[PDB]
Coordinates of C-alpha atoms in Angstrom, one line a residue:
Chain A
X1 CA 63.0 237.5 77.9
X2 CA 66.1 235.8 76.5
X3 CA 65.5 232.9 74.0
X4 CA 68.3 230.3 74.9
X5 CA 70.0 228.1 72.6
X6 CA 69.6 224.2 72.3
X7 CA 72.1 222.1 74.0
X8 CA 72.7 218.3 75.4
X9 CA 71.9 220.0 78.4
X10 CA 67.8 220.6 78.0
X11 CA 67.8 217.8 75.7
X12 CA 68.9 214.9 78.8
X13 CA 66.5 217.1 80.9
X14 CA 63.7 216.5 78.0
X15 CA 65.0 213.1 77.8
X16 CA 64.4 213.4 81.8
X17 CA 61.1 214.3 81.7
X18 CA 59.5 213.2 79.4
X19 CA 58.9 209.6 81.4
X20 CA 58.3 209.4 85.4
X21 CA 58.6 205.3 85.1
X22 CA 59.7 203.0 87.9
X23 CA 63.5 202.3 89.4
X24 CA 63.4 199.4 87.0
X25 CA 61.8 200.8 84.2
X26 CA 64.3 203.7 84.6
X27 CA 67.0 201.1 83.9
X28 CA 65.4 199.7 81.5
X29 CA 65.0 203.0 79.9
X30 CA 69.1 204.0 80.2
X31 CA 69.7 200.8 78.1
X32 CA 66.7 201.3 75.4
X33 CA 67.7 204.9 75.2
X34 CA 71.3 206.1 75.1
X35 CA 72.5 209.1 74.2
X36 CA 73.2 207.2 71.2
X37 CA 69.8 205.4 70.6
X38 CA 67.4 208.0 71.9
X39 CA 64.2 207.0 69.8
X40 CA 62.3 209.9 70.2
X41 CA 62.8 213.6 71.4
X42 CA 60.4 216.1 72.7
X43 CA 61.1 219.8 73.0
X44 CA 58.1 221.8 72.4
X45 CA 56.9 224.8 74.5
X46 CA 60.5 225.8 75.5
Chain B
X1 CA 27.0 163.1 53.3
X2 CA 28.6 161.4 50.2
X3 CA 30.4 158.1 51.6
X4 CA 30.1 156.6 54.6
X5 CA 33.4 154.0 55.3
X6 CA 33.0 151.5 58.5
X7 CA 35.7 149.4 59.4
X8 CA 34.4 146.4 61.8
X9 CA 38.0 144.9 62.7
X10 CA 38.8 148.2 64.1
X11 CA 35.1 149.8 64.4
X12 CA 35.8 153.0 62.5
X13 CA 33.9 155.2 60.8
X14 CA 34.7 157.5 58.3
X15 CA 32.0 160.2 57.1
X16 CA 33.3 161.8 53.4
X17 CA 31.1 164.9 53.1
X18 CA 30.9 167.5 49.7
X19 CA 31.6 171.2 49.9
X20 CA 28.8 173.7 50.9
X21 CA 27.8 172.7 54.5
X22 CA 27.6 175.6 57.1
X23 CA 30.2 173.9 59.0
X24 CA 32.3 173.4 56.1
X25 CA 32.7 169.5 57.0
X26 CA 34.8 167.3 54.7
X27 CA 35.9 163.9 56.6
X28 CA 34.6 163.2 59.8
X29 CA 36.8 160.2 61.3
X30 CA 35.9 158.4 64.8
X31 CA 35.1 155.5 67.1
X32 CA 32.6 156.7 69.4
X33 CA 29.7 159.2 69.4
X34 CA 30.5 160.9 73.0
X35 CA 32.4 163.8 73.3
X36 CA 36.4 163.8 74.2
X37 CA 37.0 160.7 72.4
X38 CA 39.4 159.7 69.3
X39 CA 38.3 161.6 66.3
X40 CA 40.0 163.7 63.4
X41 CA 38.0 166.2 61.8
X42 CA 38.7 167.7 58.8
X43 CA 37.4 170.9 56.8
X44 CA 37.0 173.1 53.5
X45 CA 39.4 176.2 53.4
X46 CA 37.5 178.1 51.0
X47 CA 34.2 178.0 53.2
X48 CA 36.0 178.3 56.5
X49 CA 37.0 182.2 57.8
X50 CA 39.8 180.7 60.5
X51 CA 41.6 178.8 57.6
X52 CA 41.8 175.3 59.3
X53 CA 42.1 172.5 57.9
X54 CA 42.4 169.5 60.8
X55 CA 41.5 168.7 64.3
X56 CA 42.3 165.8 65.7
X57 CA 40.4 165.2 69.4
X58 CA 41.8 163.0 72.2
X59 CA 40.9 162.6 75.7
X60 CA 44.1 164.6 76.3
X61 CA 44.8 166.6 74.1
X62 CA 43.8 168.7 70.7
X63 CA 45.3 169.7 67.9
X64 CA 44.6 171.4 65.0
X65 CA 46.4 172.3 61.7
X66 CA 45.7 175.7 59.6
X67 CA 46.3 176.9 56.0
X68 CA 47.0 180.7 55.1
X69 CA 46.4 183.0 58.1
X70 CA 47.4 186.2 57.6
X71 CA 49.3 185.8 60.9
X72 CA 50.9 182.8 59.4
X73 CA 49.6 180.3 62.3
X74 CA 50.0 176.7 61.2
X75 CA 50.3 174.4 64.3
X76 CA 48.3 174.6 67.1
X77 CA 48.2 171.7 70.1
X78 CA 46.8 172.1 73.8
X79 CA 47.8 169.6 76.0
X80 CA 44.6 169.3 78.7
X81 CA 45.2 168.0 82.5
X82 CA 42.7 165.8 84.6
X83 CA 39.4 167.7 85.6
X84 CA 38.7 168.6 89.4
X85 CA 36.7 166.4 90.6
X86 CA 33.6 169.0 91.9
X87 CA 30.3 167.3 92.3
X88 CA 27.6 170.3 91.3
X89 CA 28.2 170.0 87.8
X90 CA 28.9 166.6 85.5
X91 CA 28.4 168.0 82.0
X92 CA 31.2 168.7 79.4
X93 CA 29.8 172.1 79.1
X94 CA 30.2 173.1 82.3
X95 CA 33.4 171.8 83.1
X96 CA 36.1 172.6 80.5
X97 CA 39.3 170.6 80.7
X98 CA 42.0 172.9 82.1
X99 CA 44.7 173.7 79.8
X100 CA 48.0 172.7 80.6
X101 CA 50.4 173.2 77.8
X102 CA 49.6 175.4 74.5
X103 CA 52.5 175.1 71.2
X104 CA 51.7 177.1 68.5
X105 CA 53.8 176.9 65.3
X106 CA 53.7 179.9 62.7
X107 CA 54.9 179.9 58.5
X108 CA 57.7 181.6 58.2
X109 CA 56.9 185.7 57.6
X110 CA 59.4 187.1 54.5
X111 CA 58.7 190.2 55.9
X112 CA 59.9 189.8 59.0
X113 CA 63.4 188.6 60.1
X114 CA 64.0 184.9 61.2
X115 CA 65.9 185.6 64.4
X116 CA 62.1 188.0 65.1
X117 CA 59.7 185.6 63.6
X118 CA 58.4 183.1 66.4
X119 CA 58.6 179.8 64.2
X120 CA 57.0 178.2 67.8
X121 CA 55.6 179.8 70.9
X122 CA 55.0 177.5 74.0
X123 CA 52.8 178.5 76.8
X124 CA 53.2 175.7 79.5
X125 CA 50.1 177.0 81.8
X126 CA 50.4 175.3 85.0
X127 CA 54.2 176.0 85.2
X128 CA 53.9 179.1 83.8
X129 CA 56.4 179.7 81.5
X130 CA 56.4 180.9 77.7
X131 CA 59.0 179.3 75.2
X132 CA 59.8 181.0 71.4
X133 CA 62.1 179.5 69.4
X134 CA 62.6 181.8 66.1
X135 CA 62.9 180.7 62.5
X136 CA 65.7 179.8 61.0
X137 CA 68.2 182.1 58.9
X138 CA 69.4 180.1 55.7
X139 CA 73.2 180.8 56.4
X140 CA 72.7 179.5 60.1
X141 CA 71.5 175.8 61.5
X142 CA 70.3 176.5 64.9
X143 CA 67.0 179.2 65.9
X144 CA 67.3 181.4 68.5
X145 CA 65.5 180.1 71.9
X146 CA 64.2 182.2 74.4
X147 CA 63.0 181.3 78.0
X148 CA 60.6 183.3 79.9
X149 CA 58.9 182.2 83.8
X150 CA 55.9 184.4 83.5
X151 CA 55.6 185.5 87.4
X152 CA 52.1 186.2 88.8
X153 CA 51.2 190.0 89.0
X154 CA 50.9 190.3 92.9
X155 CA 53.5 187.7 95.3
X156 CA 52.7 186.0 98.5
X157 CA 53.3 189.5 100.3
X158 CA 51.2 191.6 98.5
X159 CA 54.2 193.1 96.1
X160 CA 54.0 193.6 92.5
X161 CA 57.0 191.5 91.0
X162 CA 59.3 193.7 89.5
X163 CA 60.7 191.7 86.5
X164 CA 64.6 190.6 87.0
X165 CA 67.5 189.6 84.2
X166 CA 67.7 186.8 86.5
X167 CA 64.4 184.7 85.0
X168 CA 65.0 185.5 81.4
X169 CA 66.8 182.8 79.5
X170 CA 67.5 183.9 76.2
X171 CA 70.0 181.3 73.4
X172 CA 70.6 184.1 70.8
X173 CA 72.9 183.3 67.5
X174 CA 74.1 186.5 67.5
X175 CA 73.6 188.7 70.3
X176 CA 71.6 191.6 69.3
X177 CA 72.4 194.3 71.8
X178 CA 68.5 195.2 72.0
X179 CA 67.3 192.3 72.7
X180 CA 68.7 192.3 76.0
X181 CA 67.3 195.6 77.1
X182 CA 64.6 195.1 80.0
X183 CA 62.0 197.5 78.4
X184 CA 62.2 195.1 74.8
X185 CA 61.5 191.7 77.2
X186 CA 59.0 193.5 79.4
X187 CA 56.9 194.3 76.1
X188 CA 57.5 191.0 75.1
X189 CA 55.8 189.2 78.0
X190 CA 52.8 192.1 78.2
X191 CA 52.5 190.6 74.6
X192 CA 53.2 187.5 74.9
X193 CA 50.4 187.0 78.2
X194 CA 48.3 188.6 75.9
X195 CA 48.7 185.9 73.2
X196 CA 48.4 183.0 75.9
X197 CA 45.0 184.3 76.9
X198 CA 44.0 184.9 73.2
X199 CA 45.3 180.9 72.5
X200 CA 43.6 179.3 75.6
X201 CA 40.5 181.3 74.8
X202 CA 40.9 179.9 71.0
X203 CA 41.4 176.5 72.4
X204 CA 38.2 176.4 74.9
X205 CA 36.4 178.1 71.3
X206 CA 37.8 175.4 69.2
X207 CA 36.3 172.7 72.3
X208 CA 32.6 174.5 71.8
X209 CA 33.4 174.0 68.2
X210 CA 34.0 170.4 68.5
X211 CA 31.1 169.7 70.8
X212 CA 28.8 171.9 68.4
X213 CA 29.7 169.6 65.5
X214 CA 29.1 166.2 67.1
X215 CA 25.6 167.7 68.5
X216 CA 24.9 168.7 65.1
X217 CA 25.9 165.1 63.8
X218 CA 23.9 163.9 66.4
X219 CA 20.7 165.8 64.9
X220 CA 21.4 164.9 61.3
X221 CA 21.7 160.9 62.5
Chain C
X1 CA 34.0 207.8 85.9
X2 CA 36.1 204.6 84.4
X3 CA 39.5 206.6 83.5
X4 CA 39.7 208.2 86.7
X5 CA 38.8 204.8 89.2
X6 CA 41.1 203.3 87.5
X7 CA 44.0 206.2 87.4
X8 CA 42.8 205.6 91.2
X9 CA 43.4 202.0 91.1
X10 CA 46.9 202.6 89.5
X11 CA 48.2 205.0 91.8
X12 CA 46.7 202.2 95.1
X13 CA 48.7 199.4 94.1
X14 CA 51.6 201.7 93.9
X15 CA 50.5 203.5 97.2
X16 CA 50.4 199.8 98.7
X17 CA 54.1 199.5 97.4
X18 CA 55.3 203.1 98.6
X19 CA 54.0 202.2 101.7
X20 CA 55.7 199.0 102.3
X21 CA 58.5 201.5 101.2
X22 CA 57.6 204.5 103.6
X23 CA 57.7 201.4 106.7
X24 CA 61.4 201.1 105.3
X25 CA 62.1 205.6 105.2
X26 CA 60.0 205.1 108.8
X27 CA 63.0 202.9 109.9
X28 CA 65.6 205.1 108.8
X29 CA 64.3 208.4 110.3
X30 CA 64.6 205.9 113.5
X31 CA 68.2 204.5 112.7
X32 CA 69.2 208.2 112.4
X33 CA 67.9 208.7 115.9
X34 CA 69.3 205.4 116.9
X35 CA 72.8 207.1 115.4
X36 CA 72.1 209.9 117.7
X37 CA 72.0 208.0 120.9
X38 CA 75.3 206.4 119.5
X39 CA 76.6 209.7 118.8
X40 CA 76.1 211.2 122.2
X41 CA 77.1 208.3 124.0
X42 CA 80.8 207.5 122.2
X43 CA 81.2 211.9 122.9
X44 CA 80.6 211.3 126.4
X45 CA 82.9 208.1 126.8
X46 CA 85.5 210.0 124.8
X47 CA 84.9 212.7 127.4
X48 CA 85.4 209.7 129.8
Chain D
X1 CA 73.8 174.6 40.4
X2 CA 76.0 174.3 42.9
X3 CA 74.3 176.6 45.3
X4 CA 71.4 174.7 44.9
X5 CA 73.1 171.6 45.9
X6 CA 75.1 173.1 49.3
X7 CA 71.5 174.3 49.8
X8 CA 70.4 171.2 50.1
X9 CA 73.0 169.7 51.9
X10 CA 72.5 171.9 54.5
X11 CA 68.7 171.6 54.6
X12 CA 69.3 167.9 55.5
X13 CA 72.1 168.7 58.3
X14 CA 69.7 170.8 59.3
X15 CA 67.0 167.9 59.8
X16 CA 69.6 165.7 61.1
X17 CA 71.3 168.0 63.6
X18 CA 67.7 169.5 64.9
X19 CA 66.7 165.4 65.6
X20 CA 70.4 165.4 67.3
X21 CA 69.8 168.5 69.3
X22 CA 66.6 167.2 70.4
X23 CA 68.3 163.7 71.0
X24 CA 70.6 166.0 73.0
X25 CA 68.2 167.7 75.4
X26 CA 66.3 164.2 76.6
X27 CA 69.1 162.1 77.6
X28 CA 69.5 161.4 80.9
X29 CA 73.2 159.2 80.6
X30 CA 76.7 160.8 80.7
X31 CA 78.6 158.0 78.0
X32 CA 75.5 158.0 75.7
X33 CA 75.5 161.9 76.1
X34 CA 79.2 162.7 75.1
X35 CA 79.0 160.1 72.5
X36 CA 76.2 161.1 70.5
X37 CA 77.7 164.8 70.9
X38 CA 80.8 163.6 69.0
X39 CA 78.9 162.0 66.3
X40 CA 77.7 165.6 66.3
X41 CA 80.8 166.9 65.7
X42 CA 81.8 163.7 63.5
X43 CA 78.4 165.0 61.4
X44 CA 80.2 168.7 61.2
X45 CA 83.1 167.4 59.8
X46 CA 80.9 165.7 57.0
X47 CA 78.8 168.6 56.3
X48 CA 82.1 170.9 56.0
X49 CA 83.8 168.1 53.8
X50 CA 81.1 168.5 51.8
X51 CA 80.5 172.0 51.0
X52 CA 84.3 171.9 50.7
X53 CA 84.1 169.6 47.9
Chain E
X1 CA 32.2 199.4 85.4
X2 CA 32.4 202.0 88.0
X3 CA 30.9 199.6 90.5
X4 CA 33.7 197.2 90.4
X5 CA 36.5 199.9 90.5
X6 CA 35.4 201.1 93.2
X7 CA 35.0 198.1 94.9
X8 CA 38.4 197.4 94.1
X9 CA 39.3 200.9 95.3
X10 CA 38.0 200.2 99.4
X11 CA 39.4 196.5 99.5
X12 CA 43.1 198.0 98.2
X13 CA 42.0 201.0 100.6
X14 CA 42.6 198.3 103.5
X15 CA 45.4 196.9 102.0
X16 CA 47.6 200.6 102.6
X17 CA 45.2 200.8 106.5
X18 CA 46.5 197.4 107.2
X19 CA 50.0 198.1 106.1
X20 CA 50.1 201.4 107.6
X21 CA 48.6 199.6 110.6
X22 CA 52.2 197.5 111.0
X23 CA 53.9 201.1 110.5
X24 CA 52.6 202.9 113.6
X25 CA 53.8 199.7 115.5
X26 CA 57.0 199.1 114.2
X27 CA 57.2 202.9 114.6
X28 CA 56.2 202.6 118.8
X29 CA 58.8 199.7 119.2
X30 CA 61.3 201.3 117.7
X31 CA 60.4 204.1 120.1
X32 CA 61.0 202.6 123.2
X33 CA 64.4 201.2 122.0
X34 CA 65.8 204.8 121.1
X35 CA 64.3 205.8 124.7
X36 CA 65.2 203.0 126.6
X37 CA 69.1 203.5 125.5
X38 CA 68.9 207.3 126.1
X39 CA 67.7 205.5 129.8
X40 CA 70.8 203.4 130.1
X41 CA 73.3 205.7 128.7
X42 CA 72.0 209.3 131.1
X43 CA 72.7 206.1 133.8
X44 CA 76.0 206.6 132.5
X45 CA 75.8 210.6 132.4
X46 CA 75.0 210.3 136.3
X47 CA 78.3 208.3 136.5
X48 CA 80.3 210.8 134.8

């Protein structure tokens, strides 16, 4: 297998995934964390 | 019971007590023996656990004054509303006086910021809605006010209310960019319903207190 | 036994809402139709 | 010294304009309204005179 | 605990019945609309 290097790419889709949330909460989530203000990220397992 | 003061032109008496009783009683001012009448109460900080130093008890309302809480909590005053009239059950006990409106005013926290440190929280029950205004910054006059119309869970349709921009009111000195994030003012009112129901259930414990005293007055007379 | 009744609680009040939302996805599998009759009938005058 | 003296300047505008403010959000009457707003603002001035001096 | 869950678990099991109940109907109304303009518009076919 190929281990792949870590781009803005899997991190928006961690940044994704990491919360199911509501339509409302998911707005509320794109103003708490931007791209800029992103409190926490998960990458494990990848 | 050290000094026992009546006035006859205006028919008050006022109990001066010592230090040591299991209530912690210090001045026990009032009018009338029954419950929900005129009376201030006054304690002992170093033998009370809740820190408070006065209530004062009217028909209407209570209100009672604190000393160093380690949450800072100085102010407290519930505002009651007229009882239901329901004819099984006539006692005091059994029918609490439903809370209306609940201010709470908190010491200022130097380890917290005073645009973040709730100098006064208002929980106005029966129109439900939740008032903070923050303290004061020493290079600024006016506190930052915040307005919030806490919804019910479910509507008349059976849909959980999704929270809107629309019902939050917030008067900010400066704006702070994440303070007007949904997810920040959604946490805020999970908190701050949390806080009413921990206030009104302080309030009805403060009542049981009240009537607990004047029934163990009533013994010691 | 707790946890999971009400994980199964959780998931009802939204199935309640997703429901009152699947009436709405009902209605436009419906309107789609609906846009078929339209489209079948405006071919057929045009063949007119 | 002087520090301590604007500080308390402003700790009694601060009394003052908090009474006004809640003077402010109780009236009911237009005239009375805009005039005790520009003894606000004549209040202001005072406070900024004295800090300036 | 459990008891009242799942108590709470049938009564918001008739809420999704009763709201799926006003599905199948606004579903069967909506039926007869699409069907009764295919009706008026193969009306129109026969007029072609």
């Amino acid at each position: 297998m190929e281990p792949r290097v870590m781009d803005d790419d899997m991190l928006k889709l961690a940044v994704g995934d990491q919360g199911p949330q509501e339509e409302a909460g998911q707005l509320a989530k794109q103003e708490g964390i931007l791209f800029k203000d992103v409190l926490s990220l998960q990458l494990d397992f990848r | 019971l050290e000094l026992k003061h009546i006035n006859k032109t205006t028919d008050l008496k006022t109990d001066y007590f010592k230090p040591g009783h299991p209530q912690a009683l210090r001045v026990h001012s009032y009018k009338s023996m029954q419950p929900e009448m005129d009376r201030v109460i006054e304690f002992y900080e170093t033998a009370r656990v809740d820190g408070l130093m006065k209530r004062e008890e009217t028909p209407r309302t209570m209100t009672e004054y604190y000393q160093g809480r380690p949450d800072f909590l100085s102010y407290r005053h519930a505002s009651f509303g007229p009882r239901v009239k329901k004819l099984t059950l006539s006692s005091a006990e059994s029918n609490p006086r439903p809370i209306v409106k609940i201010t709470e005013r908190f010491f200022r926290n130097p380890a917290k910021p005073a645009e973040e440190d709730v100098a006064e929280r208002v929980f106005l029950v029966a129109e439900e809605r939740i008032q903070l205004r923050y303290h004061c910054r020493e290079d600024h006059i006016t506190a930052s006010k915040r307005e919030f119309l806490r919804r019910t869970e479910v509507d008349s349709k059976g849909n959980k209310i999704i929270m809107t921009p629309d019902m939050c009111i917030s008067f900010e000195v400066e704006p702070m960019e994440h303070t007007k994030k949904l997810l920040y003012q959604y946490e805020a009112m999970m908190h701050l319903k949390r806080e009413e129901k921990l206030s009104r259930h302080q309030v009805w414990e403060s009542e049981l207190e009240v009537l607990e005293i004047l029934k163990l007055r009533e013994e010691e007379e | 036994n707790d946890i999971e009744t009400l994980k199964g609680e959780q998931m009802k009040l939204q199935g309640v809402i997703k429901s009152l939302e699947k009436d709405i996805q009902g209605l436009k599998r419906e309107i789609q139709e609906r846009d078929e009759t339209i489209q079948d009938k405006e071919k057929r005058i045009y063949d007119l | 010294e002087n520090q301590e003296q604007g500080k308390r300047k402003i700790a009694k505008f601060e009394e003052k304009h908090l009474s006004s403010l809640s003077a402010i959000r109780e009236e009911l009457e237009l005239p009375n309204i805009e005039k005790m707003i520009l003894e606000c603002s004549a209040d202001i001035s005072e406070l900024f005179d004295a800090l300036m001096t």
